[PDB]
């Protein structure tokens, strides 16, 4: 009652702990940057579009934020 | 000549102004059998504020340009919304997905909202928004005679006159501009 | 090499392949017994909502996709028209279909098409084996390379775990291929009826509780060809707005007047009936010939029950007939697996016509109808499928005999009870844990179908892709079948999965949800009235012993 | 003109219904008084924003006439006095009880050439009878290699799939059959369906809608009729195998459409079939192909009884006439239980139609997949049939001798006629229009007009006395044949109240490829004697 034929992919935490990662100066940015690299991406409809259209949409969001922000100072 | 055992023949128009004929017993069952999905989302949650949000974003985006004066920024956002509303509500006839038998294939989305019932809350909201937008624009920014005249003649013949109960199920055919409409 | 490869069968000893298909129980403390709901009304369901901005974002995304979608086709078909010869007229013949009628499948479903249909080889047990493909162009054609990797499944319909390749059921089927053959004689009305068909008809009748039964060969065939036998242009049919397609095809063919009512409202129905009786027939104002009420035993999309105690009372004050469909509840619900008529305590003679199928639980394709005596006699001659269609084969029937007996407790002593408590326990355990972690789930606190809601459109394909790598299979739905705001993923439990697999499932779904920001709960879901966000270890340690109690479940 | 007159009542009656109208209009006046143009434009738009908001819901005009002048006392009286009808009428349930008490049941043996039957709830028992009612014509599913493929598939794949065609259900063995059928019949692809009876009603509505035109045969089977009813499109009819009528009908439709000046041309179809289910004669293909090419029509052929009986090998009607299926026929609907030897059904066509069918067909999207052993067994039979073609030659030889024996006779010329074709494997017999009159006194036209009027009036009871007498007489001939001699034959079983097209009771004899010439010759003589003995007296 303890044998099967499936291989278990280890959980995301487990892989790091085995390889020996327990540090934390620029170590608390790799993960914090990745967290910011999902909030912006997911909520916009980026998966359903095409490459050419997504290229224009990414450029559009960059320029709109830039013009809004630099005009704030000036 | 000979006539068929079962006849479902679409009929064109023979006059400039014509009305979609009332449906028969079989058409009534087809429409009533399945609840529609084009007109259901109007009553759902968060389907009223989204019009206020779109107006605000369009005003801010158009105001972002440096050389645009406040008069022409209001006229632009009034142009974009009135044109956009008219295209979505009163232009595309039928249904996008597959409805049984194509019974909903001669009426627009506005007359498809809430089972042709009139004077419902949703119709009260959608007819009260453009009137407020036109009033605030013309009071907030001073206009001359030419611009005030033009924007009025877009607002009226584009967002209010079609939605009136009188113009319901009415099709206008001009021998050159639009083809012979489908009356049945 | 551009085709789907024909996979070879893996080779192993006997014990190993008896654990791939049906896992054994861990401890005797993982069993729960259902109790009846006699004498208690059904409370109104409670629903949860996410914050405003999520709904606002969903509207913005669909508006953007729709605007972009129409623009692509107009520029294409009008200007570059030599790569779209399959959507334009060619030398006097109209095209097979039009652009508008197919604007959704081509333009909003094509990119997510890799998830929807998957080739598989092997028996669908608690581990399902899948072939591997690599996507080319943008899902235009697929290339297959010849490997197999097992995956845990939550999609296949084996509620009681009869889908086995080595056991009593498969022994009985193999013996039949010797005595009978795999060929059907023809229409049941002239030749092709054997004693095996008669025995199953009697066994189905005793099991469910009515007086007599009939047996067909397709669930779609059973319902589609049934309604025209006793309805005409002078009848009225009142049906719910969330019923299955097989029922609807029978009615539109019949031609009776159809009126529908909002789902879950037991008042608006009464206003509809009092109105329709007085008005009468159209254009003539004459009384209706008969009024029929259709409903469903359990709705798959929502996972909520039908208030049978109310419907039985209403069909008695106004003299209306009643029709009930129990496909997802015949063999796996109730205290002893008989259906909605048992869990609510209503007497079986109140309902007029019953229906069901064999695929979902007992493990074979077919269907049955049960009614009173004189009702069956007239329907046996007025029906068209009996005299024109084909008949069902023997091995499908032989298993259905050797499964309706195990659950009933005749051929096997203690396996039916040991297969109706496990599925009850698993559904109790998964539903409480997901509610405690912070997700939003629908249901009636016992339905095996557990839908989880995802609102943003891009979040659905990402969730599905991410977990096949994590080695788990799921299924999703979209706008053409569900409201614009609400999209969901659907879980199907089984009697084979154990406590450990649920733990293994819970860990992976916890991490995925945290990454995608999926836990958006409120105080209405819990019972105390305050939001909750618990740690994973506390959930796994406490939930298994608290899922048996009832007071913790909201509905 | 005097149009300004009515507008005055409106805007005065509007302001008096409004709780305050004099003040608000006065306030708007004084604030924007510079130019009248402005004050006009805003006094209007806001007010109809007010009046429309203050109005009340109004319902559309429906067919049912409203009764708003009824007090609650009446509505309680009307609802109480209502009296419904029974669910199914038990008035005449005993009259048709003989057709269900005569159904033979086989006891613990496969349906083969020699079986054992009992009738009427174990009351009577007959043993070692000669079967002539089976619907299988080749008997290749009973061989050893087919059985071994079945057992292995059962062990390794279980009994049945547990998922719809959409996701988990389609599997590797399924796709193998689709590739195999397409290669064998020379088509680009194919699609499998759960049941043959639900094939035509599920594919025809997919490609047909309102505004189309369909030209169908004078008499077709029931499933074709159901497909036409669900299509929701104009449907014409032309005489049974009359090319002049088909040409005249197609010429008229084309000329009318050209004169109409319509922007987009609609979809047109031609619906017929191969070996007819009720008549059992053959349809001419070359005329249909030449007519569809000149007049721009699509062709739809529903062959079920000719898949494995026609042609030098068994590829269907296309092989028999020496043509190709890629260009002759657009849509083909077939079945597997009649000849191949297992349940199911398939559709043949090019790639575009199959792709649209995977998503737009109700019976495929919303139903489960076929079991594994059915698919593997058929694939084995296809491989055996392609390897050798001896069974088809023998079946063709017996069918020709059977029809020749009953149609070259002379003493049955005044009682029965043969309405079949020499290539058909089933022989149908009816009664001459003169003999039927002498004992029952009615014709086909009188039956069709009576039933059509009965259906239109929507009466609750449908019962025809002379039609029942003919059915009882035919069943008497079948019973006599079986009691004295060990021969079992069947009669064409129909449900009259579901038919729209004219039809008459008949009697049919089947055949297959595992009999012998000596046995079939003696069965022919015994049936001949049975028909005479009952009729002559
Ligand atoms: C700032 C700059 C500038 C401005 C700008 O941005 C950039 O602004 C940008 C914003 C853009 C608009 C955004 C959104 C729309 C609405 C859309 O709505 C489609 C509505 C679809 C459904 O509608 C029909 O629905 C039914 C089915 O057809 C009809 O009735 C049935 O009745 C019975 C039902 O059973 C049966 O009899 C039949 O089924 C039938 O009769 C009903 O009458 C009719 O309404 C139709 O769409 C198709 O219509 C054509 C025909 O199918 C397509 O093919 C033809 O298109 C051209 C035609 O001349 C030529 O190329 C060729 O002839 C040929 O290819 C065409 O490709 C395509 O549009 C049409 C395009 C438009 C205006 C865009 C244009 C481009 C912009 C102006 C951009 C622009 C660039
Ligand atoms: C002189 C000329 C000057 C040119 C100036 C240029 C002006 C640009 C005008 C752009 C107009 C674009 C309008 C596109 C609308 C086309 C929609 C056709 C789709 C047909 C589908 C029929 C049924 C599906 C309906 C449905 O389910 N809809 C829903 C989605 O599922 C529905 O989409 C969502 O709930 C959101 C509703 C938001 C409502 C806000 C409308 C405000 C106006 C927006 C215009 C934007 C203009 C951008 C430049
Ligand atoms: C430049 C365009 C936008 C102008 C000319 C459009 C005006 C249209 C919409 C107006 C002008 C006259 C109006 C009109 C004329 C006559 C009648 C007949 C009457 O029994 C009901 C109202 C009805 C049907 C209305 C409908 C709307 C019409 C046709
Ligand atoms: C900006 C445009 C759209 C404005 C001016 C036009 C509106 C139309 C619809 C209005 C203006 C005058 C109205 C009008 C004039 C006169 C009459 C005759 C009266 O016995 C009944 C109402 C009736 C028939 C209405 C119908 C609707 C009309 C024609
Ligand atoms: C008055 C001018 C400035 C116009 C442009 C302003 C507002 C419009 C929308 C208003 C003003 C008067 C209104 C009006 C006048 C008279 C009638 C006839 C009545 O039987 C139905 C309503 C109807 C058809 C409405 C329709 C909407 C109208 C025409
Ligand atoms: C599953 C479904 C069917 C499908 O019947 P099958 O025999 O599985 O093809 C019929 N009825 C209901 C209610 C269903 O959910």
PDB file of N, CA and C and ligand atoms in Angstrom, chain B residues 152-153 156-157 160-161 164 166, chain D residues 6-7 10-11 40-41 44-45 48, ligand 5:
ATOM      1  N   UNK B 152     -24.292  69.849 -30.338  1.00  0.00           N
ATOM      2  CA  UNK B 152     -25.696  69.583 -30.060  1.00  0.00           C
ATOM      3  C   UNK B 152     -26.281  68.640 -31.100  1.00  0.00           C
ATOM      4  N   UNK B 153     -25.990  68.899 -32.370  1.00  0.00           N
ATOM      5  CA  UNK B 153     -26.470  68.093 -33.485  1.00  0.00           C
ATOM      6  C   UNK B 153     -25.759  66.749 -33.598  1.00  0.00           C
ATOM      7  N   UNK B 156     -27.933  64.979 -29.793  1.00  0.00           N
ATOM      8  CA  UNK B 156     -29.309  64.629 -30.125  1.00  0.00           C
ATOM      9  C   UNK B 156     -29.591  63.518 -31.128  1.00  0.00           C
ATOM     10  N   UNK B 157     -29.141  63.688 -32.370  1.00  0.00           N
ATOM     11  CA  UNK B 157     -29.349  62.686 -33.408  1.00  0.00           C
ATOM     12  C   UNK B 157     -28.441  61.476 -33.272  1.00  0.00           C
ATOM     13  N   UNK B 160     -29.858  60.106 -28.227  1.00  0.00           N
ATOM     14  CA  UNK B 160     -31.161  60.299 -27.612  1.00  0.00           C
ATOM     15  C   UNK B 160     -32.288  59.902 -28.554  1.00  0.00           C
ATOM     16  N   UNK B 161     -32.277  60.425 -29.777  1.00  0.00           N
ATOM     17  CA  UNK B 161     -33.322  60.155 -30.765  1.00  0.00           C
ATOM     18  C   UNK B 161     -33.458  58.667 -31.095  1.00  0.00           C
ATOM     19  N   UNK B 164     -35.347  56.612 -28.183  1.00  0.00           N
ATOM     20  CA  UNK B 164     -36.706  56.961 -27.807  1.00  0.00           C
ATOM     21  C   UNK B 164     -37.662  55.802 -28.090  1.00  0.00           C
ATOM     22  N   UNK B 166     -40.434  55.889 -29.507  1.00  0.00           N
ATOM     23  CA  UNK B 166     -41.128  56.041 -30.783  1.00  0.00           C
ATOM     24  C   UNK B 166     -40.368  55.348 -31.905  1.00  0.00           C
TER      25      UNK B 166
ATOM     26  N   UNK D   6     -50.043  70.211 -31.447  1.00  0.00           N
ATOM     27  CA  UNK D   6     -49.956  69.122 -30.474  1.00  0.00           C
ATOM     28  C   UNK D   6     -48.783  69.248 -29.493  1.00  0.00           C
ATOM     29  N   UNK D   7     -47.704  69.897 -29.937  1.00  0.00           N
ATOM     30  CA  UNK D   7     -46.506  70.015 -29.107  1.00  0.00           C
ATOM     31  C   UNK D   7     -46.854  70.894 -27.910  1.00  0.00           C
ATOM     32  N   UNK D  10     -48.384  68.895 -25.018  1.00  0.00           N
ATOM     33  CA  UNK D  10     -47.373  68.009 -24.454  1.00  0.00           C
ATOM     34  C   UNK D  10     -46.535  68.709 -23.389  1.00  0.00           C
ATOM     35  N   UNK D  11     -45.967  69.873 -23.723  1.00  0.00           N
ATOM     36  CA  UNK D  11     -45.025  70.531 -22.820  1.00  0.00           C
ATOM     37  C   UNK D  11     -45.726  71.315 -21.722  1.00  0.00           C
ATOM     38  N   UNK D  40     -33.705  77.108 -25.195  1.00  0.00           N
ATOM     39  CA  UNK D  40     -34.532  76.083 -25.816  1.00  0.00           C
ATOM     40  C   UNK D  40     -33.901  74.700 -25.679  1.00  0.00           C
ATOM     41  N   UNK D  41     -32.588  74.598 -25.926  1.00  0.00           N
ATOM     42  CA  UNK D  41     -31.932  73.296 -26.063  1.00  0.00           C
ATOM     43  C   UNK D  41     -31.902  72.555 -24.732  1.00  0.00           C
ATOM     44  N   UNK D  44     -35.478  71.353 -23.072  1.00  0.00           N
ATOM     45  CA  UNK D  44     -35.926  70.119 -23.684  1.00  0.00           C
ATOM     46  C   UNK D  44     -35.273  68.872 -23.121  1.00  0.00           C
ATOM     47  N   UNK D  45     -33.941  68.813 -23.201  1.00  0.00           N
ATOM     48  CA  UNK D  45     -33.222  67.574 -22.915  1.00  0.00           C
ATOM     49  C   UNK D  45     -33.399  67.119 -21.474  1.00  0.00           C
ATOM     50  N   UNK D  48     -37.371  65.744 -20.783  1.00  0.00           N
ATOM     51  CA  UNK D  48     -37.606  64.363 -21.161  1.00  0.00           C
ATOM     52  C   UNK D  48     -36.673  63.403 -20.436  1.00  0.00           C
TER      53      UNK D  48
HETATM   54  C1  LIG E   5     -36.867  70.482 -29.134  1.00  0.00           C
HETATM   55  C2  LIG E   5     -35.532  70.340 -29.856  1.00  0.00           C
HETATM   56  C3  LIG E   5     -34.539  71.366 -29.321  1.00  0.00           C
HETATM   57  C4  LIG E   5     -34.981  68.920 -29.750  1.00  0.00           C
HETATM   58  C5  LIG E   5     -33.708  68.749 -30.563  1.00  0.00           C
HETATM   59  C6  LIG E   5     -34.722  68.536 -28.319  1.00  0.00           C
HETATM   60  C7  LIG E   5     -35.195  67.494 -27.673  1.00  0.00           C
HETATM   61  C8  LIG E   5     -35.912  66.318 -28.273  1.00  0.00           C
HETATM   62  C9  LIG E   5     -35.092  65.048 -28.024  1.00  0.00           C
HETATM   63  C10 LIG E   5     -37.346  66.226 -27.723  1.00  0.00           C
HETATM   64  C11 LIG E   5     -38.054  67.605 -27.687  1.00  0.00           C
HETATM   65  C12 LIG E   5     -39.564  67.336 -27.855  1.00  0.00           C
HETATM   66  C13 LIG E   5     -39.665  65.818 -27.767  1.00  0.00           C
HETATM   67  C14 LIG E   5     -40.892  65.156 -28.327  1.00  0.00           C
HETATM   68  C15 LIG E   5     -41.888  65.849 -28.872  1.00  0.00           C
HETATM   69  C16 LIG E   5     -43.115  65.255 -29.194  1.00  0.00           C
HETATM   70  C17 LIG E   5     -43.258  63.925 -29.244  1.00  0.00           C
HETATM   71  C18 LIG E   5     -44.551  63.307 -29.683  1.00  0.00           C
HETATM   72  C19 LIG E   5     -45.092  62.342 -28.646  1.00  0.00           C
HETATM   73  O1  LIG E   5     -46.291  61.723 -29.130  1.00  0.00           O
HETATM   74  C20 LIG E   5     -44.053  61.291 -28.345  1.00  0.00           C
HETATM   75  C21 LIG E   5     -42.738  61.918 -27.885  1.00  0.00           C
HETATM   76  C22 LIG E   5     -42.147  62.947 -28.876  1.00  0.00           C
HETATM   77  C23 LIG E   5     -41.728  62.217 -30.167  1.00  0.00           C
HETATM   78  C24 LIG E   5     -40.876  63.643 -28.218  1.00  0.00           C
HETATM   79  C25 LIG E   5     -39.536  63.071 -28.703  1.00  0.00           C
HETATM   80  C26 LIG E   5     -38.291  63.808 -28.174  1.00  0.00           C
HETATM   81  C27 LIG E   5     -38.375  65.315 -28.443  1.00  0.00           C
HETATM   82  C28 LIG E   5     -38.389  65.609 -29.951  1.00  0.00           C
END
